[PDB]
């Protein structure tokens, strides 16, 4: 009943670690997360954002354990077992165990240019299977998760499904909502493809990786943690989180008949704050335009250095940074110290020298300069095509400016790149996550929940849940030529208006 | 050079008080503000909201002084004088000196039922004139505000105008915006009705009481202070405020030619957070439904007790609580103490006993039972392109629905006999139902060391809901309904059906889309 | 299982109110605590210290409930019952229900000059008996505290004893601890004078009002709350409190054999922070020298107004402020609004006019001028191994020194004519002048799943000063001395010379050693 | 007039960066500080203590600039120049630029076992001379710090002296205090060995590296920053810091006649909080006993791996981790990623495999176990105390082993005795507050004073320093409580038998 450890945490005060979760924390696979920054290169703009994936993972664990333990005590008819509490807890603890260095770059532009095979969710699942089948881990968890191969393997399957599964996405297939009760009961019964548990435990899928509306404990932890680290204020607070946890129940989904996590309708504004806070932290922190400029230098360095950096894998074979996802043991040797590996390399191949040049430009702040931005409604597109169209129209406009003002190709020779940021609440361009959250009325002590009225987002939210930012990165030389820089900024705005993305 | 006092403050750490602002703080008129709760009856739901008008006024002073002092150092060409800095600072310090007890009730339902003459802004102006003409204050301020009676009087006029004036409201009238630029200048030249300063100091009107967009330092202080006291998180933070103060300049308004306070365009999101935070604190804190129920009991007590409670005015005449606004001296004897004056009264007139009964209901938590609520778009109040009409129609439709429920379920009038009242709250961002304050804030581009712009029409479409205001409609019934949930649930069902049946709301859903 | 209310609190985030504690909160007697400032007149120096006794009492309740509920889950062999948990919780909630207005002045100088009979702990016990015997409260608590009159009466007796009892003070008497342990057990057996529970529940007496070492939840709450409201940093933090709650057990006292609350020995520094934080907040906040100056004006006003202010008691008899402690009903009409009652009085008796004059001096900041201070070891009060004697000797020596200064510098009696008063403050850790509270706290070793120990004599020697208490001696003169710094500086010099010349202090130095 | 950058900071909200301080921040030498943890291995106990030397250095800069700028505005008669403000600012920014990886281990046990040449203060001074003599830095600072070689070199000398100099230590030579005014004025005049400024600017030496009483802006920043990161509450708060900055003046030292930073006497409690907060964070955070256990594993790994890890220096020569302090360019390639260099090494030499074994024990939490501790007054004597306690414990365990017939089960137990110095700074006996000058009243030349001898008697324990003596055992004893209990009993009996502890 006493925790093995109580660990100081700056968001919650402390995190309690019960036996045998301590055995998962004290593995090389979990301790690796101390050497991955939660927010990647954001620290080059917000220097206090140097918090690790380790502290996020402990925080996320603490929330998943607290929420399932609260549900078990307030609704004994759910039949939540010690096994359900530990599986859901472990999924929360290990959801993030498979990030590479600078994960969003590693899985994004680096993976795209390199044809990389696996992304962090795939690697998480591989590392979870590796950790849970270690004999010194199985001997500690067997009394909770099962002594038989069948029982233990089902428990491990549930842990990986709580991360990877999307068991409610069928409910949004066209006309599922208008089907008769009969058809519906049968469809839900035969749609159930989860192996680790039956439909009677469907609500656990809302806790760890909530694909339906993004209201998972991972989200709640990183909003609070990343707000505190960045100093950017958000409406979702520690007190907001405690309000949700004091007003949470499992109810029947009126659309599927499955058990779902619901909140008291008096908390709808508190749930809306989760999506609004996500979009705010994306706009101000994670996709800050100077962070984006430095990401382009880091991706070039990783691509140029990638063949030369080698990691020993399972069978003593060496894997390059470009192939490390092909072997879990080699992958586990990678950290954010990849940056220092490049800087300290004694390899004199021209490509290594190019990678070192790019990293040294970051440290001297020799980065691209801002040549304008606008925000736009994703609907006015019908994002890569928008970027290509804006870049082509800007080039035409700069040619016309160059010839009309007789600048002898000074404008036509300017090097610039058009980039985009998706600034959303999660989910799709058009849907606020709050619209897809179930609520209950009254103070229950079986309850059927409801989704909000169509009026709620009309009265409280902008028409679209997502905006795109289109921005221009120029050669740093343009910093000393404001008259040229001003023409590129003018061209971006005219290209936006000429495509009907912006009104003048 | 050095402040006379440095006073601890929980929002900023400290407030610096330079000479001779200390002399205004140390007056009976300013010290009275210790005994007025900034958020009225909110403390009966949020018990930590017991902060005074005194701490808000010191905070608001500190921001006005910091902002004008920053502008004077950053933009010497503005010709900001010590007299402009002190007048703007004092207007910020004293803007709230004229509140009555439980101000929003005092100036709202109490004033309406009583036909009260003056509201807090009127009383502030009267008390400002009284403070600044005290011999012991004039002797301290004459060296800054003017050694001639005429000069001193002009400074006092400026202080009161920074609170009461609306010098930019002409810019929105007629089609002033479409007028030939030259005629615009002539109109602006002849519209200038401010006596205490010329149009070259127009930007000072943005600092204290900003009628054009509500972005004054009074608003910035209360959002931070009321958020911290309530525990309700908002996007406008102390760091947001410091960002605005590090990115503020005076620029020319492209629509009037007048000097205005502007912010860097990189801070547009930080400015939008002011209006969004105001609406959030109204929805969650100031117009909390249980606060509104207890306000109805407090107003009944004040109306019933009002004739019996007397305050000595100028020349020793007694004024009732219902007439105190007619004499500044009698008004200055009023505080939130009025609640204890009623409770402790030895008057046995039936009306005093009714006031005591109502206050004892608050203390025993004998308050109305919640019988449902909904939010609505103000536009849905009519079918053409009336909050009171919404309230009357909802109440009439609920009565009809409860009659049908009563007869269909054979409840022998137990539903039809339920007493309930329908109320509304206006939950807005500070201006009109349709306009986000951010649309009416001027910004600048680049890192200047001159002409501002208003946001594109796209900004509100991409970032804000269609309407800046929402209405909440809610039902209060007899407290006894707490012990009869089956009956209470029918009334809550009737409110939802009534909203839908009058086209005020569309229903809660069985699927997202 | 579910709380009736969850109430926002700025120290803990929230306080959970289980049924039927909500019924005690919603009484006129508990709601009165909204209108008593927790730190009295401190707000005239620290304007954010306007938090009420109501918020402190809810916080204190929340800690007592959490601690006893944690002990019941961690140590089922203690046989903690629902009745023990609710009695201890209620004692914590209501310990502070009996404070008067400006309690420390009311029970201190006002009571001394007036010969007042009862102090706040006496009134708390009277008000607790009144609340728990209300028919609408007994109907809610009878199912937990007892369905027979005898059982209910025993529960109410336990609630009052957890506040007033001192069951461990015998352990320090005589040479009790050198006694043969057999005789010790029989003495402890026959010393047990508590009626509401047996000695098997002795550990509950450490929770609410801890006379033995002051480590009660009331102390833990006010240190956190008063630190946050004042902005004065202390070592005892919210995280320190959670550390104690995660490392707390009931063990056997090795000196008495009674069950006592103990902490893990790894938390000894966290416990020492409680007494050190108390002394710091006394020195910096509660006994701030400008607060003490304004207290002298407030006590004079209360004494002068006291006969004229009347409160209706049981059977409709009127009690003056000087007699209100003689009738619980009359006492319950008093709040901090007594200050406004004086200010607004229409009585023209010269004594009422004197009270109004004193309160107007506070509002205009017409307070005494500081004319020096020093700190001293209480041991230096006599030459053998008398705060009043220190104060008399300092004042007499200063007078002689000022006479010599006046004649030597030919100031024609301008120094000799200065009016001043010498005062003292006791700045201690809560027990006696010589004992650090931590020395009297039991600890345990290891991670048990039984006999505690007191700290080694080395702990205090290595970590604490020799004395747990210091005295501050300070001088208050006429406010006019603010405008005559050359005279003021001579008086400050005289205080330092007077302290040195009486061997109360050694002088400020020209080199560290 | 406007800062070039305003950078978010979790302690102050923001740090303003004026031109041309931005040019020093945007160097590889300063950016390296992002990859050195301020608190070393503390994060293995307090996982939120992962803040870098970079954020501490920016904070320390911001305080030094604010304090000297405030003094310049409040006391124009000090003749503080733009050059004094920028030299003092830069010394504060760069004081910490020369730490190695896991600095306290690197300069402590690693250096002792390796005979390492230089410590971090020496390397700071080398790196400051390298940065300030870069042509693209000199071209930016020449207009403030001097266009002539002589002027520029004087300014660079002042920056390095504000870090290394101890110009007031002569004031504590026996009998200096009792000398006549004549002798004193002459002694102070001829003791002045600072080259970068004259004695009229002595007060600047109190700002950056305060060797007299430790009341420098470096100390004030790390107490606030490390308290916030650790979640360990202290009496020194951000509001305490603002109180000091609102009540600070330069006054004449009554003992030397030199100008010194002084605080209003109403702030004596607020100054005492600095030393008390330092001792608290040492006891609870920096010298946490589990941190110490993991330090012994990390030192062994660094010693075993040190010959194999190589860094390219100035002339393309390779320097081992054990020699990197011999070449500033090789030193600048070192970071906390040395831990990952060991873990990922393909070298199969037995010593490299031993280093990897030790680091993998840290990650699996296979660390020594606690076998007791006590606190002691240093006057009852630290290396000798550790050796005596270990020898007496060994004798006591032999007597226990034979008397209880345990056939050498006690005598075979492997354990190590360690010590921690838990102090307020300075010496075992002196509270820093006793050595701080204060002033009286509200001045607008003032002579300051030191506190009465009574102040520490009434407010502080008799000694300013305590020692903690503790035992680390083989992790096997975690499963042998009866054996572990005898070692704990032996430590206590050894303390009592040497009169360090009383019954
Ligand atoms: Mg441990
Ligand atoms: Mg003062
Ligand atoms: Mg309620
Ligand atoms: Mg920039």
Curated annotation (Swiss-Prot), chain D:
Where on this chain does Zn(2+) bind? 56, 95-96, 218
Q: What class of enzyme is it?
A: hydrolase
For this UniProt entry, what is the primary localization, expressed as one broad class?
nucleus
The catalytic activity of this protein is classed by the Enzyme Commission as 3.1.5.-
Q: What SUPFAM superfamilies does the database record attribute to this sequence?
A: HD-domain/PDEase-like
Top-level taxon of origin:
Eukaryota
Q: Which GO molecular function annotations are given, in alphabetical order?
A: deoxynucleoside triphosphate hydrolase activity; dGTPase activity; GTP binding; metal ion binding; protein homodimerization activity
| Reactions performed catalytically | a 2'-deoxyribonucleoside 5'-triphosphate + H2O = a 2'-deoxyribonucleoside + triphosphate + H(+)
Q: What else is known?
A: Does not hydrolyze dGMP and dGDP. Shows significantly reduced capability to hydrolyze the chain terminator triphosphates ddGTP, ddITP, ddTTP or 3'-azido-3'-deoxythymidine (AZT), in the presence of dGTP activator. Able to hydrolyze an anti-cancer agent, araCTP.
Q: Which family does it belong to?
A: Belongs to the SAMHD1 family.
Q: What is the name listed in the Swiss-Prot or TrEMBL entry for this protein?
A: Deoxynucleoside triphosphate triphosphohydrolase sahd-1
Q: What is the lineage of its organism?
A: Eukaryota, Metazoa, Ecdysozoa, Nematoda, Chromadorea
Please name the gene that encodes this protein. sahd-1
